[PDB]
């Protein structure tokens, strides 16, 4: 099947001082956001109609409560332990926890913690594993959390029991949008001149779903190795934009075309020949 294969929740706890702390949460399906988190009410924002996906309102309320209690508890406990862990305000704590469905059937769960912009910890088989970037502080953190077995049991239960059946449920509940095929809108343009007597061949591709695409500058069947591909930049309404450039002379421009290969095109590719 096409589309996303992994569900995960992200956390961004910003600590300004020993009294101020702001947490930012959201649920994602690869690159597509399906949940929001209101830090004021301590509840979830279901962005899509199928965001609850086969889960009861009781279980959703149960899960929302666990996050609510954790978000406040963690922020408050970090402030109390900041002195011992030699923390310097301000700092940012990041977290990513979820599960992914791989080829063959296996659903593998994950949890990763971060301090600053670098890695801090990871949960491997319901145990705290400190990363080398975290140093002695991460070693001190994992040595402390291993003592609280119950917290690791909540982590284990949510990652290896709740997440796999939630992921499967939400992939079926939203297949109409996740497995959906959107035909890309492609057009050619001329960018800034890369030297006197030279042109910038720009090939724009926008509004395509799923994310896997193939764009190249062609002279018949020949693939031009000078094709400078951009980043898959996101759009609203769950679509993507990609720009492929090529530096060539004025005479070289004639006979060139832009080939676009996408899953929604059903074999017949978009070939845009250059016109002066």
């Amino acid at each position: 099947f096409q589309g996303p294969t992994s569900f995960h929740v992200i956390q961004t706890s910003s600590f300004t001082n020993s009294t101020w702390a702001q947490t930012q949460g959201s649920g994602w399906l690869d690159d597509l956001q399906i949940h929001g988190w209101d830090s004021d009410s301590g509840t979830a924002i279901f962005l899509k109609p199928w965001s609850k996906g086969n889960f009861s309102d009781k279980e959703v309320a149960e899960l929302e409560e666990i996050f609510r209690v954790y978000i406040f508890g963690f922020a408050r406990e970090v402030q109390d332990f900041a002195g011992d862990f030699q923390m310097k305000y301000p700092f940012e704590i990041q977290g990513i926890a979820g599960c992914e469905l791989h080829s063959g059937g296996a659903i593998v769960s994950f949890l990763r913690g971060a301090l600053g912009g670098l890695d801090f910890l990871s949960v491997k088989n319901a145990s705290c594993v400190p990363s080398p970037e975290g140093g002695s502080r991460a070693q001190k953190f994992c040595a402390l959390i291993i003592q609280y077995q119950g917290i690791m049991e909540t982590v284990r239960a949510l990652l290896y029991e709740t997440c796999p059946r939630y992921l499967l449920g939400v992939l079926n509940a939203g297949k109409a949008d996740l497995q959906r095929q959107v035909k890309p809108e492609a057009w050619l343009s001329s960018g800034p001149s890369p030297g006197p007597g030279r042109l910038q061949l720009v090939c724009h591709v926008s509004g395509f779903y799923p994310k896997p695409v193939w764009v190249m500058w062609m002279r018949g069947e020949q693939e031009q190795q000078g094709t400078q591909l951009g980043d898959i930049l996101p759009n609203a309404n769950w679509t993507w934009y990609l720009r492929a450039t090529l530096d060539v002379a004025d005479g070289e421009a004639a006979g060139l075309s832009c080939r676009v290969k996408h899953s929604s095109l059903e074999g017949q590719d978009i070939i845009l020949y250059w016109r002066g």
Binding site: S206, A236, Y241, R243
Partner: peptide, 25 residues
């Protein structure tokens, strides 16, 4: 960037994708 090609008179969407930064503020 734009969602559709730049055409005068016709309505469009202007996107600004800010990425690869730390801290979040």
């Amino acid at each position: 960037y734009s969602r559709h090609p730049a055409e005068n008179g016709k309505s469009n969407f202007l996107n600004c994708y800010v990425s690869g930064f730390h801290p979040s503020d």
